[model samples]
Target: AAQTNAPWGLARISSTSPGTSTYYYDESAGQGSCVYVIDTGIEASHPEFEGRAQMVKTYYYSSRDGNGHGTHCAGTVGSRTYGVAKKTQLFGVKVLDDNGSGQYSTIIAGMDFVASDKNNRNCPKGVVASLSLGGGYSSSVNSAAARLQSSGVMVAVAAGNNNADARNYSPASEPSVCTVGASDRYDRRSSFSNYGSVLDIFGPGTSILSTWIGGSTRSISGTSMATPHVAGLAAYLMTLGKTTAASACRYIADTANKGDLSNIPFGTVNLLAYNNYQA
Candidate 1:
C-alpha cells in the first residue's frame, strides 16, 4: 500500500527536510472528525469527496458551489485524493456568492451556523472551520470568530493576500483564530501572503492542487489555499485527542517547524504547519 504520488504539500508536512515525496500519517486519520468549509460552497458529489462531503447549510439561497474556491478548499481539507485529513467529513456552509465574495454579515452568519451545528453534535474530538476568505477589519466578524473558538471549534483563516500586515484584516487579526499565511514548495513565504503578528502559521498555498467545481481539479495560489491545510491538520489533531481549539492550537505551535521558512517579514511567526510527523 505504499505510494509516491502524494502532493508536495501533504508530503512536506510528513517530513522535516521538505525534500521528500511521501506522505505519512496514522491509519485512523480523521476517521471521526469533521471540518466546516465556510466559504462559497461545495460540490457534494465530487468524486474526491467520496460521499464524505455534504452541503449542510447555505446563507446565499442555493446550495450549489458555483464558485470553485469552496470546493477546492474542502478538497484540501478532506477529499480522498488531495486532503490533509483524508477521512474527515466535510460540511459546506456557503457564505459567499458565485463570485467568491460576501458581506461581513453573511460571513458571520456562516460562522454562527457552524457554532450552532457543533453544539448540537457530540464531536468530542472537536470540529474545524476552514475560512478561505477575508476582508478589511470587521468587529462583528472578529467577535463571531472568537465565539466560534469558544464553542469548541478550531477556526483556521487566511491572513489575507494583500502582502501587508495581517493585522489590517478582521478574523485574521482576531487573536483566537489561527491565522494562516501562504508558503511555497521551496519553503518560502509567498510574496502575496500577508504576514505580521496576527499570522500564527504557514501552509502550502502556491500552486496547490485540489478539487474544482465540476468533478475536476485545479492548481491555485493564495492565503485562501493555505488556510485549509491548517484546518485539515487541526482535524487530524482532533482525532488524536487534541479535542479542543485551545489544545490543538498549543500543539500546532509547539510542533510547528520553526524558522524553516525564508522571506518572513518582521513580526511574523516563521512556523510552518506540521501534522506531528517527522521523518
Candidate 2:
C-alpha cells in the first residue's frame, strides 16, 4: 500500500497559556539552548527556517530524498520561524538515512553524537534531544536512553504510532525517556497513538501542519509528530530554568486538559492534572 501524508489545519493556540505552552516562554524563547533531532533530517533552506536552524551536525544512514517526514517533525519541534521553539538551535542527525529506515546501531550512534558533541567546546550546553524513530524495544537502546537522561540531557521519544501499546517499542518504553503520546486538538488520544503506563505526556499529533520538503506544507499523523511538540515544550521549559527532564514532563502532564477516559481503553490517567502539580 502506498502511504500518503495526512492533511492538517492550523489552530489558534497560544504558547502563553498556562497549560498549553508548558510555561516555556515565561523565561525566554528557548534561546542559547540546543536541541538534537534524531530523525530523517531537515530541509534547512526552507523559508520558515532561514537563519533559525543551526545544523550542528548531519548524518545520513540512507540516501537523502524528498521524504518530508523528518522535515515536518523538525518543523514542529523547532522550525526556527515556524515552530514553537523558534529560538532554539537544532542538530539534525539523520539516523534513518534516505530510505527512512535504519538499524539500531545507527540510532545509537546518533544518540552518542548528541551526548558527546552537545557539550563540546564547539557545541552548546543544555541540549535537549528529540527522537521520533524507534522500533521494538532493545536492551541496549534502553540503557543508552537512561544514561542520557541521568546525565541531565532531556531525552524525548515517540511512543510509536502502532496504537497497540508502548510495550511494543524500545526507547519509548524506557523509564528514563520522556515517552510522548499523540492527542488531537480536542484533547483525546489519537486513534493510532500507542498508549500504556509508559506514556508520560500527550501532545498535538493528529493533523499537524508543518514545513515539508521542496518548500511545501503538509500534515502528518503519528506519535512522531506528537513527540516533538513535547520536545519543543521541554526546550521552552528549559529556557525558563527548568533543567530536569522529569520536571518538564511533570509540568506537561500536570497542565494537560483532562479529557474523558470512560470510553478510552486506558484507565484514568489525567495528564492535565499531572501538569498542575508543583514541586
Candidate 3:
C-alpha cells in the first residue's frame, strides 16, 4: 500500500461565518439507504460513528487495520460527524490487510460481494458502493466494475493521488465508475490529485477532518477523501428520484461548478450547487 503526502491545506482554512452555519442541509440524509464501503476496518465505536455503522457483512482478506488508511478513509465517508451521509447504513468489507495492501483479486471479491447483493435484491433502496483505493487500469477489474454498475449499484472511486492522469487506474478509469478528483475549499485541485478527461467530478478532499482511531482525529488529503463526498451526495440524490448510477453521475456533473473549468482540466463539484439544482 502506498501513501501520498496530504495535498490540501484544509486545516488552515478560516471558519469565519456571520453567526450562521453556511452549510446547507441536504434534506436527504440518505434515509432508508445503504452503501458498501470496501476498505480497511472501520472504527465502529468512534463517537461520531457509533450507532450509525452497520456491519451487514465483513470480508477480511487480510489482518485488520494494518495501516489505518482504510479506517481513516471510512471515517471521511461515513463517520457520523464528518460523513456526508450520516444516517445511511454502511457495509464494511476489509479487503486490504493490516499493511494497507491487497491484491487485485481481493478487490474484485469485494466488488463481487456487492454485485451479488445488488443482483439478489439483498440491498435495500438507494444502495451504492464507495471505493477509495486504485491501482493502474486493468481490463479485468474494469469488467468487474462494469458488472457492478450495470447491476444498478453506483460506484464512487478515487481518481488516484498521482497528480498526473486519472486514467491510470483499474476501477476509476472504468467507464461506468464515477471517478472523483480532489479539490480544496478554494475550488483548486489538490496538488496531488490525479486529473484527466476520465475524471467525472471533484469534491472536498483537502485537509479533511474525520474520525481517526482511538477516538482521536487526524487530517489527510487525497482523492480518497473526495470520493465519499460524491458517495454521500449520490445517496442524497437517491431521495430526489435519481436512483440509478447513471442518473447520479449526471446529476453530479450537471450540478458541478462549471464556472471554474478554466482553472483545472476537469470539472468541479459543489454539493451546494447540486442541492440548489434539486430545489
Candidate 4:
C-alpha cells in the first residue's frame, strides 16, 4: 500500500481509510467483520495480515506455527494479497497439533472460543471460522459446529480430499456448515475434491500461493485452500446491510453457475460460484 494512488492486486478494489486506506466496493465491503482461521495454527506476525490478526495458543497451536499449514491457510483468508476480505480481523485458533492432527474434542473446544464473546467487543458481529482439516464424522463435532453457526458464527470446513461423498465427512457433512471443495484455475473440480449435496461451493485450490511459515510464501493445493476463499468472501459479505451467516452462504451458492462442473455425482449443485467482491 503506497501513499501514491496505485491500483493493483486486491488493493485495486479494496477500501482506503484515513490512517489506513480501504479498498474494494461499498463502505460495508469488509467493515465490522472478522475471519477466524481455525487450523493447525497461524503466524500472527506474518506480514500478510499487516499486524491486525490475533494469535492465541490453546494447545492446538502455540503462538508460533511449528508446521506451515495454518499459516498458509490464514494468508489466503486475510492477507492483503491472495485474500478476499482485506480489512477483516483475523484470529488464529489452533485446533490441530503440529502434525495437523487433533482430537475432535479439541476441535469442538476451538469452536467454542470462536463463538464466545469478550470484554467490550462482541465476538465479531459478522465472523467466519475457516477449518481446513477433516476425517470421519463425529456427532459431537457436528453438534458443536451447529452451536457455533446458530450462535451467528459462520463455519467453513473443507469437503475433504478423499474423492468420496462429502456427506461421509464430519463438519462438511453437517448441513448447517459451509463445506468447500476444490477447483482448478479452469473452474473444473480438482481431481481430489469430494462431492455431494453437503458441499457449499468450489474454490481455487490448485497451486495457490500464500504466506508460509518462516516469513515466506509457497504454493499448495487441496480443499483446504478452497475453504478460506469462501471464508474471506463470507467476512466481506457480512458488512453488507442485508446479510447474515446463513444468508451470505445461500447467496453465494444461489448466485453461482450451477452447471460450472457438469456430469459426475456433483450434478448441477454446489458447484463453483463467482465471487463478486466488486460489489
Candidate 5:
C-alpha cells in the first residue's frame, strides 16, 4: 500500500507527501480520504484525476471551473501526476467565480457547506479543506475554520499572494487553519508570497504546472498554489488513521526540512519532505 516516492516536479517533499517509511502514513496515496477544495471549482473531468474527483456540493456558482485555479489546486491535492495523494477523493466547492473572485462572506459559506457535508457524505476521515483564497482577516471565516477543525477537518489556507505580512491576511492569519506560503523552485520563499510569524509552513508555488480548465493543464504561481500541497499532505495522512486535524498539522510541520529557505528566516523554512524513508 505504498506508492513510490515519485515526487511532483515542483518540490521534493517525501515526508509531507507521505511516501517515506518513517512516516505513519503509508503509500495509500490518500485512499479513503477526501479533500474539499474551496475555490472557483474543479474540472471534475480532468484526466489527471483518473476518475477520483467527487462533486460533493457546489455553492455560489455552478459546479464548473471557469478560471482554472480550483482545478489546478485540486490537481495538486490528488492528481495522478501533480498530486501528493493520487488516490484521494476530491470535492469541489465553488466559492469563486470565473473572474477568480468572490465575497469574503462567500468563502465562509463555502466552509460551512463543506463541514456540514462531512457528516452527510460520511467522508472516511473528517476531511481536509484546501482554501487558497484570502484578502484580510475575517472573523466569520476564522470562526468557520475553527468549527470545522472542532468537527475534525484540517483546514489549510493560503498565506496570500501579496508580499505583505501574512498576519494581515484573513484565513491565513486566523490561527485556526494551517497557513501555507509559497516557495520557489530553489526552496526559498517565493518573492511574491506573504511571510512573517502568522504563516505555519511553505510549499512549492512558483511555476507550478497542474491541471487546468478544459481538461488540460498549465503552470501558475501564488500562495494559492501552496495551500493545496499542505491540504493534499493532510489528506494522505488522514488515510493512515490519524483521527485529529491538529495531529496531522503537527506531524507535517515537525517532519519538515526546517532549512529549505533563502529569504524568510529558517524559523519558517519551507517544508520539503525529508522524513525517515527519504533519509
Candidate 6:
C-alpha cells in the first residue's frame, strides 16, 4: 500500500477538511534524499527502519539511543512503518545526551559534522537535518544551523513547546532555517506550541505515533514531533529537484495547506505542513 489509514498525522497531511482515514502519497516517497536525526540518538537497528536507518555520528561513546526522542523523530521522518519519507536514508547524529540534555558546543559539533559528511560521495543526493531541540537564544547555535543550511542541507527545527512567541527561542528564531509549530488533529494550534512569525508551518504534533526506544512505538506530543514531519516533507521535495536549502523551504511554504488551522497565535502563519503527495 502506498498509504495507510491508522496514523492520524499521516492521514491528516494528505487530505484537507472532512479528513479521511487513509493517507495517499507518491510512490517515490523520499527516495534520493537523506535525513539526519540530530537529537539524543537513534536505535538504528529498530525493525521499523527495515535497515534503512543507521547511526553516522555520535557524541556519546556508544551510539545507542538511551532517550527515545530521537528515535521517535527519526521514525516520523523516514521509518517504513511510520514515516513521511519512507525510503529516504536515515542517519543518526547524537548531539544530546541520554537524558535529553546537551551543551551548545556538542550540538554545534554535530551540525558541523553533518555539513562535512553530506558532501561525502556516500551521502545521498539531497540532505536534510531534523533538529527537534532548542533553548534560550544562542547566536552561536543559530549560526551553526545557518552554516548547515549554507552547506546545501535543508534544516527543519522545532518552534518549541513553551506556548509563547517562537521568537524567544534559538533555532526557532533563526531566519535561515524552517521553524515548525504544533497542531492537533482538529487543526487547532497545540496549546503548548510556541507561535509567532518565526514559525514557518505547523504539523500534527499531539499524540503522534512513531518508533521509540526498546524497539517499540510510542505516542508523543511536542513541537519536536511536528518538526520531523516538515523535515520529511522537505526530503520528499528534494527528490523532486527542490534540493537546495532555500528551494526546499520555499516549496514547503508555498505548497502548505493554508488557513485550515484554528487558534493560531497572532504572528504565526496558519499554514499546515503538507507533503503534497497524492495517489
Give the whole-model CA lDDT for all candidates, comma-separated.
0.87, 0.66, 0.66, 0.71, 0.76, 0.86
Give the per-residue lDDT of model 4 (tens digit) for 1-279: 222222122332232211122335444435678877888788878887788677754564255677878888888777766566667777888888888887998888888777784222343548778889888888888888887787777788888988888888878888888888887655567788888888888766666677888888888888998888778777777766446786777877765545655333735264564445443
Clashing pairs in 6: none
| Candidate number with the higher lDDT (1 or 6) | 1
Comparison by TM-score, 5 against 6, better one: 6
Model 1 CA lDDT for position 272: 91
TM-score of each: 0.96, 0.82, 0.83, 0.85, 0.89, 0.96
lDDT of 6 by residue, 1-279 (tens): 356565777777777652565766776778878999999888988999988889888998878899999999999998886898888888899999999988999998899899998876254558999999999888989999999988888999999999999888888889899999999888889889999988888987988999999999999999999999889888877876655566787778888899999999677798988867656
Segments in model 1 whose C-alpha atoms lie over 4 Å from true places: 1-3
For candidate 2, the C-alpha RMSD (Å) to the true structure equals: 6.1
How high a TM-score does candidate 3 get?
0.83
lDDT of 1 at 65: 99
How do the residues 1-279 of candidate 5 rate in per-residue lDDT, one tens digit apiece?
334433433235564332132222256777888899989899988989988886666665477888899999999888987887778989889989878888877888888888888777656754899998988777787888777666778898898988878877888887867888888767668899988777888877777778999988888999899788888888877776654576777677776767667788534545543322332
Query: Alpha-carbon error at 123 in model 3, in Å?
Result: 4.8
Stronger candidate by TM-score (3 vs 6): 6
What TM-score, to 2 decimals, does candidate 1 have? 0.96
Each model's Cα RMSD: 1.4, 6.1, 6.0, 5.6, 3.6, 1.4
Candidate 1 structure quality by residue, lDDT tens digits, 52-85 = 9999998777989999999999999988878888
Give per-residue CA lDDT, model 2, range 110-212, as digits (tens): 7887788766723242667888887998988877777777666788888888886787797888887888877665556778878888888766777788878
Off by over 4 Å in 6: 121-124
Span of ten consecutive residues with least summed lDDT in model 3? 10-19
Which candidate ranks first by lDDT, i.e. highest?
1
| lDDT by residue (tens digit), candidate 3, 1-279 | 111122222111111211122334354566666677777766666676767664444556433454656666666555655666656766666776666566888888878888786554444457778888888888878887788777778888888898877777878889788888887767667788877877887776777767776777787888887887777667766755665565787677776655442246533332211333221
Ranking by lDDT: 1, 6, 5, 4, 2, 3
